[PDB]
Design a protein around this motif. Structure first.
Motif, short mmCIF file in Angstrom:
data_model
loop_
_atom_site.label_atom_id
_atom_site.label_comp_id
_atom_site.label_asym_id
_atom_site.label_seq_id
_atom_site.Cartn_x
_atom_site.Cartn_y
_atom_site.Cartn_z
N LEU G 19 27.78 22.40 -9.71
CA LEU G 19 27.11 21.34 -8.90
C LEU G 19 26.04 20.96 -10.15
O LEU G 19 25.14 21.67 -10.40
CB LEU G 19 26.45 21.89 -7.67
N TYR G 20 26.11 19.73 -10.49
CA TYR G 20 25.15 19.21 -11.78
C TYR G 20 23.78 18.98 -10.98
O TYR G 20 22.78 18.94 -11.66
CB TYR G 20 25.82 17.69 -11.92
N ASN G 21 23.83 18.86 -9.70
CA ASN G 21 22.34 18.95 -9.07
C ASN G 21 21.71 20.31 -9.12
O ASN G 21 20.56 20.35 -9.14
CB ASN G 21 22.28 18.56 -7.70
N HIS G 73 18.20 9.55 -6.99
CA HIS G 73 19.00 9.77 -5.85
C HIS G 73 18.95 8.68 -4.67
O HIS G 73 17.86 8.45 -4.20
CB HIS G 73 18.57 11.08 -5.20
N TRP G 122 32.78 6.00 -2.25
CA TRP G 122 32.99 7.11 -3.72
C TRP G 122 33.85 6.39 -4.74
O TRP G 122 33.65 6.54 -5.82
CB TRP G 122 33.50 8.43 -3.13
N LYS G 126 32.94 5.59 -8.32
CA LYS G 126 33.69 6.27 -9.60
C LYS G 126 34.06 5.03 -10.67
O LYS G 126 33.96 5.00 -11.68
CB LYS G 126 34.63 6.98 -9.03
N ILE G 141 30.87 12.24 -14.37
CA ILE G 141 31.01 13.25 -13.25
C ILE G 141 29.54 13.44 -12.73
O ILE G 141 29.22 13.44 -11.50
CB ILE G 141 31.67 14.50 -13.48
N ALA G 142 28.52 13.85 -13.50
CA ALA G 142 27.42 14.30 -13.21
C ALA G 142 26.64 12.99 -12.29
O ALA G 142 25.91 13.25 -11.56
CB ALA G 142 26.47 14.51 -14.48
N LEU G 144 27.88 10.98 -10.34
CA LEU G 144 28.49 10.70 -8.99
C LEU G 144 27.62 11.59 -8.00
O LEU G 144 27.67 11.19 -6.85
CB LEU G 144 29.86 10.84 -8.97
N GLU G 145 27.38 12.77 -8.39
CA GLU G 145 26.99 13.75 -7.38
C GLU G 145 25.30 13.39 -7.08
O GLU G 145 24.98 14.11 -6.07
CB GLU G 145 26.56 15.11 -8.16
N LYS G 146 24.97 12.54 -7.58
CA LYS G 146 23.39 11.94 -7.08
C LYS G 146 23.68 11.19 -5.96
O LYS G 146 22.44 10.52 -5.64
CB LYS G 146 22.65 11.38 -8.35
N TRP G 148 24.53 10.22 -2.09
CA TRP G 148 24.44 10.78 -0.67
C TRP G 148 24.80 9.78 0.24
O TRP G 148 24.11 8.96 0.90
CB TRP G 148 22.96 11.43 -0.61
#
Ligand SMILES: [Mg+2]
Lengths: 258, 181, 155, 330, 175, 52, 193, 51, 53
Positions: G19-21, G73, G122, G126, G141-142, G144-146, G148
């Motif tokens: 997880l990049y978070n 975020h 999502w 992307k 990728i990094a 997208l994980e931000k 919620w």
């Protein structure tokens, strides 16, 4: 300074000059930018650091996983000077010089040949050079030195026929050269007052010999008091007598008196 | 030498202490725009100046400090930005390698970009203000009042718009202080 | 030259007095007095030898060494290289780019941070008529008249 | 209890201003170590001045009452506070007038013959330490020129305790310097033994710090296993012997204050890297190694010890003398 | 054909594996790398760099309420002449100054007038001599010149203009 | 988050210097004050052999 | 010479994907990280995706650097009530390819919505990210994980206190309208002179 | 020091009007002989206008 | 050209001036002062001859 010559190395290698190579420098090991080819900008600290630290370990570099020789030991530095004096002056020439000196008090040099005179001068020069090289290690190791090697410090000078300075004699003057042109760059251990530092080193080693002799005498007296009897070994008695006579004579030869 | 001058004594006394402290300057020199400070060094293009010489920079697009900023359209006047030429040398070599894949001819052109490195010693600013100027209206005010806002600004909340994206109440309603006082 | 002190300390120049290559001797004869009068602080170390290295060395005040090759090079070029030596400080080597124009970064007003202009919101030029406001008699008359007019047209 | 509550709040990153004002305005009580540890995080200059005054008063009170545990806790807290302070001058003055070095060294396991030696020779190391750590190469070149200039034509020597700031001229002669890291002492000390085996070579040197020694002591006094305690005690006695013999280099707390940049907090992980940065910036021609463990996080600084995206630091923040040393780990 | 061999030999240490072990493979790799890097620097690097700086300036302006388009147009109008690099430097290190520039562009402040064309003084049409005095146009030009001299910085010449113009009278020796 | 950004704003106001280390480093180093160990060997301020 | 090891992580590998978070890489900053709230009631999918990505990738920051992947975020709320204009939920295709032969999956927006409403947001995030970052797996990728995503209005991110981000669409524009006619107010001096 | 120079003699029109009087503004539409289409002056036209 | 005696032009040289080899005695110099002809390398053939192909 890392790969070429260390602190107490008798070698002299210009780290930026490849004079010990049988091939032109094709590849440059330490390269940071593509512009390091047509103008490597070597000589700058931040690049010669990379180059000399990417250089491989040599026989004197003593790489990490390989063992590192004990060099800062006085008990090794003294026999180094002694073996250099023996390599300079042979036993026959040494005996001839000792006889000539004890017979004429440095007045009948005409008996020695010019080749022997030049051998003596070259030996004195090499001894002075190696003393200038070992001076930092000697000042480092003077703390935990032993009496045998402290006396060998004068034995080697006597053998090499170099009278140590005291506030022939070859350690009295410095090498001529104008201070504005003499090399003074940092990182290279090079003393500039050799007759001033070797003289105080001789004073310190005389004090250290006195301290070691007094420590030996006090230890012998304490052992005798603990035994509550005057039963000394013949070996120890003979050793004490011969070492006292030897230190007296060999310090009187140089001119220092306790 | 860093004082402000204006025929209005009130505005002069009000704006005089606002020109003290460190000052930066956006300057134009060598067909390049630099941002110089009180002790910042910069590498400007090659100038025919002897090393270790004090020089002054003519063009100054902007001056500023922790409390003020004076812009020049197109240039400013009265700014004394003195630097000292530290050195003059070539920069890192750029190797241009021109090769034609059809013929047999390769050209290796080295470009060491020569440049003069300078250190800005001192920066002084002494302007000649005319008067207080209104922002939302081009009229030049004839008087200057450091207490009252020269242009009152009101929040944006009408209620007519039902889909107006509502922020937080304190963000929407937050008055400001008075800096000149 | 930093704060009034030259960075270059020594200039080593090796030459030969009888063999050949008259370029270095021309330089020592013609331009050396001019250079020595211009920069008397630097020390010029001349080295006569049989086989001289056709190179000039500059030793600076921090141990750095910068060498230039002057084989069959004119004394004018030799003087130019010597002046380049005394001009450069030879303490670093950085390219010429927009990111390298300024050697060190600094701000006098303050570095931007995400919470500087975060709470600053948009406003309006002047006061706009609210929707929940107490209508005066004039506004009452006006709006009721507009409503009645459109209702009359519809009817 | 109130002080440790304020410390818990400042660790949670929300300092109770009311509790701080109470602890700063209520006299007749020497402030414990938690208060001076908590104040070190804040940046308020009058707060730090008042905390320094309270620290001096509390140290004097503890010295008068002769309570060793309170004295040592206050020494550690005031050490962190002096590392966090900005004015290096007043920090070093406070340290050298309250005698932090000798008292802290007396607390270690076998560091007594070096503690009293440092307390005795503190008068000479201060003189040998230069004024400004900028252009050390130029300073030692000027010293070499002075030594070459013979003044004559134109006492018994005893090698003092090894200190880096005083023997800067010795590291340039040294080719390789191994900086010790406390995390190395895990289940074995043979790596430290192999390190001290290279000292009598004359080319290799060893650099230990007061922060590293304190870390070793605390991890020898508390640890999950017994091998860690035994190894750290053995390492402490080895380092003490090497220092008293005069082979390894030690960093007293006064020199640590003088060297570390202003206002920057430092610990066993950051001190190693700031020493390495100072070496690589001022003494470029010495090969610096770090004796660390294969699990220590401080081995890779640019990913663990790196701060945030700071605009005042570039990729060249190490080779310039204007930027602080800790600006290099970016 | 001049293959850059003796120059690119010294950069083989930057490569890895077979390119670093053998010579010709590494030379080919370095030749191709340098050629493509030169091509990119000539024809494609400036586009990306200016796009990056433009995006940064646009973000800094959007955080205040405007956009790159309006900001650039109004800067060109007000004749500020600040390159995108300087705009980015101000946005990153002088937020107050950049905000003041944005406020200047947004306000209704009259932009400077166009540069006035150089005119000829009225005295150039006067008959001279009208029948050892100076020309009136030349005297007015000298007066304006001395005014511009004294206008640039402080100097020991003084603020008055007549005494500085009449310096030849001072240098003249009374016969 | 509110307390964090408030503390960060106050630090940016009253720093008058540059900060280049991670803000969580101090908390990771002083987590021993927050946690508590009831063993025979518990670390406190100024722990040394003279104490134990 | 830099070298990436061939022995990389894999989805079948037991170590798994990170997880990049939670990661602690050099090019990953976490100090300047703000929390924004974005309500998606009525706002169109591509517009809200672009607005979210501009704050996710950190492009709105003046110190944005392509290497350093920093951002804010964004918490998107009421994705179930997102609105696209008519006939698009039926006509817009979403296709992909699988490893099996002839495995060209082609689903409608309606199908993806009835499967999972967050999948549409999502996918559009992307796309908006790969528009600028497609070369590096990290840079694509990094970010997208931000994001919620949340289908309904409830969300557990109440402690971070997300600010209600306000954004204006580029569509607002006032076409020229007829000049309204009104009575002119005269003046006594004007009537006099 | 600095140079504020627009023409050869450093003179320019009065940039600031009288206190209280209406200021003068340049032409925003491009110099086109046709009224349509009304086009705002681009930055290059602004540079050409300013000199 | 220098404006004052105090501020002379620098001595930084360009490529044209720096990249200059030593001077060889030409026919004019050898005819003007024959004291310079001291070796066989001074007897250069007619300047019309460029060299080998
Ligand atoms: Mg270009």
């Amino acid at each position: 300074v890392y790969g070429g010559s260390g602190r107490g190395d008798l070698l002299y290698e210009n780290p930026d000059a490849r004079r010990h190579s049988g091939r032109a420098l094709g590849v440059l090991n330490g390269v940071r930018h593509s512009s390091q080819a047509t103008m490597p900008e070597s000589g700058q600290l931040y690049y010669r650091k990379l180059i000399l630290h990417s250089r491989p370990p040599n026989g004197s570099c003593a790489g990490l996983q390989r063992h590192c020789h004990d060099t800062c030991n006085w008990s090794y530095l003294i026999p180094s000077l002694h073996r250099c004096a023996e390599s300079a002056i042979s036993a026959k020439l040494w005996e001839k010089m000792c006889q000539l000196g004890l017979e004429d008090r440095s007045k009948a040099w005409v008996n020695l040949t010019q080749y022997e005179r030049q051998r003596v001068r070259d030996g004195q020069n090499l001894y002075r050079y190696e003393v200038h090289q070992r001076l930092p290690l000697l000042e480092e190791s003077i703390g935990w030195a032993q009496l045998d090697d402290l006396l060998g410090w004068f034995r080697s000078a006597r053998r090499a026929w170099v009278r140590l300075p005291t506030s022939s004699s070859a350690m009295s003057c410095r090498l001529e050269g104008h201070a504005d042109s003499r090399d003074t760059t940092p990182g290279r251990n090079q003393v500039f007052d050799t007759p001033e530092r070797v003289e105080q080193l001789t004073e310190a080693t005389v004090h250290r010999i006195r301290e070691e002799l007094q420590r030996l005498n006090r230890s012998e007296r304490s052992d005798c008091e603990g035994s509550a009897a005057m039963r000394a070994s013949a070996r120890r008695l003979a050793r004490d007598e011969e070492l006292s006579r030897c230190v007296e004579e060999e310090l009187g030869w140089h001119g220092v008196a306790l | 030498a860093n004082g402000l001058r204006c025929p209005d004594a009130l505005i002069t006394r009000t704006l005089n202490p606002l020109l003290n402290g460190p000052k930066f300057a956006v300057i134009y020199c060598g067909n390049h725009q630099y941002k110089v400070a009180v002790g910042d060094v910069i590498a400007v293009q090659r100038l025919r100046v002897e090393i270790g010489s004090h020089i002054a920079l003519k063009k100054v697009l902007m001056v500023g400090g922790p409390r003020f900023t004076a812009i020049g359209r197109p240039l400013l006047e009265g700014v004394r930005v003195t630097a000292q030429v530290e050195e003059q040398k070539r920069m890192r070599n750029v190797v241009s390698l021109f090769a034609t894949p059809g013929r047999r001819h390769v050209r290796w052109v080295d470009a060491p970009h020569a440049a003069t490195i300078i250190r800005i010693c001192e920066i002084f600013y002494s302007p000649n203000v005319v008067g207080e100027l209104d922002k939302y209206k081009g009229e030049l005010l004839e008087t200057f009042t450091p207490g009252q806002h020269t242009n009152p600004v009101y929040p944006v909340d009408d209620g007519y718009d039902v889909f107006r994206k509502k922020d937080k109440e304190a963000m929407e309603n937050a008055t400001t202080f008075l800096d000149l006082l | 030259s930093r704060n009034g002190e030259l960075c270059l300390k020594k200039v080593i120049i090796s030459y030969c007095p009888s063999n050949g290559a008259p370029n270095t001797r021309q330089f020592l004869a013609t331009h050396l007095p001019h250079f020595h009068a211009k920069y008397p602080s630097v020390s010029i170390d001349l080295r006569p030898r049989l086989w001289p290295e056709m190179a000039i060395t500059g030793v600076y005040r921090d141990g750095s060494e910068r060498s230039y090759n002057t084989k069959n090079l004119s004394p004018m070029g030799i003087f130019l290289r010597l002046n380049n030596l005394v001009s450069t400080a030879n303490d670093y080597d950085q390219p010429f780019c927009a990111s390298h124009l300024h050697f060190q970064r600094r701000s006098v007003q303050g570095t931007w941070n995400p919470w500087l202009w975060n709470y600053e919101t948009e406003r309006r030029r002047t006061e706009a008529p609210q929707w929940r406001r107490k209508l005066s008699e004039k506004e009452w008359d006006y709006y009721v008249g507009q409503y009645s007019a459109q209702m009359k047209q519809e009817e | 209890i109130v002080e440790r509550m304020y410390l818990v709040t400042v660790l949670c990153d929300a300092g109770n201003n009311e509790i701080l004002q109470l602890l700063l305005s209520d006299t007749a009580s020497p402030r414990g170590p938690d208060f001076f540890a908590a104040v070190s995080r804040t940046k308020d200059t009058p707060t730090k001045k008042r905390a320094l005054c309270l620290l001096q008063e509390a140290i004097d009170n503890a010295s008068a009452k002769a309570d060793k545990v309170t004295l040592l806790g206050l020494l550690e807290s005031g050490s962190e506070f002096l590392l966090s302070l900005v004015d290096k001058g007043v920090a070093h003055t406070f340290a050298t007038q309250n005698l932090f070095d000798y008292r802290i060294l007396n607390s270690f396991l076998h560091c007594s013959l070096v503690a009293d030696r440092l307390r005795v020779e503190q008068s000479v190391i201060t003189s040998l330490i230069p004024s400004s750590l900028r252009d050390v190469q130029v300073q030692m070149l000027m010293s070499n020129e002075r030594n070459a200039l013979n003044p004559l034509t134109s006492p018994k020597l005893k090698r003092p305790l090894m200190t880096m700031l005083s023997q800067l001229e010795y590291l340039n002669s040294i080719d390789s310097v191994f900086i010790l890291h406390s995390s190395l002492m895990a289940t074995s000390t043979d790596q430290l033994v192999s390190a001290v085996r290279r000292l009598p070579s004359g080319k290799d040197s060893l650099i230990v710090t007061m922060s590293c020694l304190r870390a070793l002591s605390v991890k020898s006094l508390t640890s999950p296993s017994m091998k860690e305690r035994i190894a750290c005690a053995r390492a402490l006695e080895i380092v003490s012997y090497e220092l008293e013999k005069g082979r390894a280099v030690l960093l007293p707390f006064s020199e640590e204050i003088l060297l570390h940049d202003a206002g920057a907090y430092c610990d066993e992980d950051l001190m190693l890297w700031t020493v390495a940065a100072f070496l690589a910036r001022e003494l470029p021609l010495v090969k610096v190694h770090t004796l660390m463990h294969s699990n220590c996080t401080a081995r890779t600084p640019y990913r663990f010890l790196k701060g945030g995206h700071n605009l005042l630091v570039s990729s060249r923040s190490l080779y310039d003398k204007g930027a602080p040393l800790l600006s290099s780990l970016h | 054909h001049y293959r850059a061999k003796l120059e690119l030999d010294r950069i083989r240490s930057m490569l890895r594996g077979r390119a670093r072990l053998e010579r010709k493979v590494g030379l080919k790799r370095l030749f191709f790398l340098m050629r493509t890097q030169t091509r990119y620097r000539v024809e494609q690097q400036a586009h990306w760099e200016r796009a990056i700086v433009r995006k940064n300036v646009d973000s800094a302006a959007r955080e205040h309420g405007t956009g790159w388009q309006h900001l650039r147009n109004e800067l060109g109008r007000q004749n500020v002449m600040l390159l995108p690099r300087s705009q980015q430097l101000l946005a990153q290190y002088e937020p107050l100054a950049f905000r003041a520039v944005v406020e200047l562009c947004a306000s209704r402040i009259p932009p400077p007038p166009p540069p006035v064309v150089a005119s000829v003084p009225e005295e150039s049409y006067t008959l001279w001599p009208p029948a050892s005095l100076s020309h009136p146009a030349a005297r007015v030009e000298l007066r304006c010149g001395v005014e511009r001299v004294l206008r640039r910085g402080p100097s020991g010449l003084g603020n008055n203009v007549n005494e500085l113009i009449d310096a030849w009278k001072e240098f003249d020796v009374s016969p | 988050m509110d307390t964090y950004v408030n503390s960060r704003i106050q630090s940016i106001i009253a720093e008058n210097t540059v900060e280049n280390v991670a803000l969580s480093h101090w908390r990771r180093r002083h987590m021993w004050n927050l946690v508590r160990t009831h063993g025979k060997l518990q670390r406190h301020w100024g722990v040394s052999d003279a104490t134990k | 010479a830099p070298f990436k090891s061939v022995l990389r992580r894999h989805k079948h590998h037991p170590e798994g994907l990170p997880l990049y978070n939670d990661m602690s890489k050099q090019w990953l900053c976490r100090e300047g990280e703000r929390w924004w709230l974005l309500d998606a009631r009525g706002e169109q999918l591509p517009r809200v995706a672009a607005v979210a990505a501009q704050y996710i990738t950190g492009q709105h920051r003046p110190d944005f650097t392509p290497g350093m992947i920093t951002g804010d975020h964004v918490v998107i709320v009421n994705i179930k009530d997102v609105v696209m204009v008519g006939d698009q939920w039926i006509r817009v295709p979403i296709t992909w390819q699988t490893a099996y032969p002839g495995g060209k999956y082609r689903i409608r927006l309606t199908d993806m919505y009835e499967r999972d409403p967050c999948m549409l947001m999502w996918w559009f995030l992307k796309d908006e990210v790969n528009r600028h970052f497609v070369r590096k797996l990290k840079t694509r990728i990094a970010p997208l994980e931000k994001a919620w995503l949340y289908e309904d209005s409830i969300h557990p991110h109440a402690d971070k206190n997300p600010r209600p981000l306000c954004w204006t669409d580029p569509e607002v524009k006032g076409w020229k309208y007829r000049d309204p006619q009104f009575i002119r107010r005269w003046k006594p001096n004007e009537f006099m002179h | 020091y600095s140079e504020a120079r627009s023409n050869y003699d450093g003179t320019s029109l009065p940039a600031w009007p009288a206190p209280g009087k209406k200021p003068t503004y340049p032409a925003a539409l491009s110099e086109l002989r046709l009224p349509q289409p009304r086009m705002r002056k681009t930055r290059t036209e602004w540079m050409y206008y300013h000199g | 050209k220098e404006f004052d005696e105090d501020h002379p032009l620098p001595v930084v040289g360009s490529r044209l001036n720096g990249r200059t080899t030593q001077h060889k005695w030409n026919h004019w110099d050898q005819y003007l002062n024959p004291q310079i002809t001291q070796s066989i390398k001074d007897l250069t053939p007619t300047p019309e001859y460029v060299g080998m192909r």
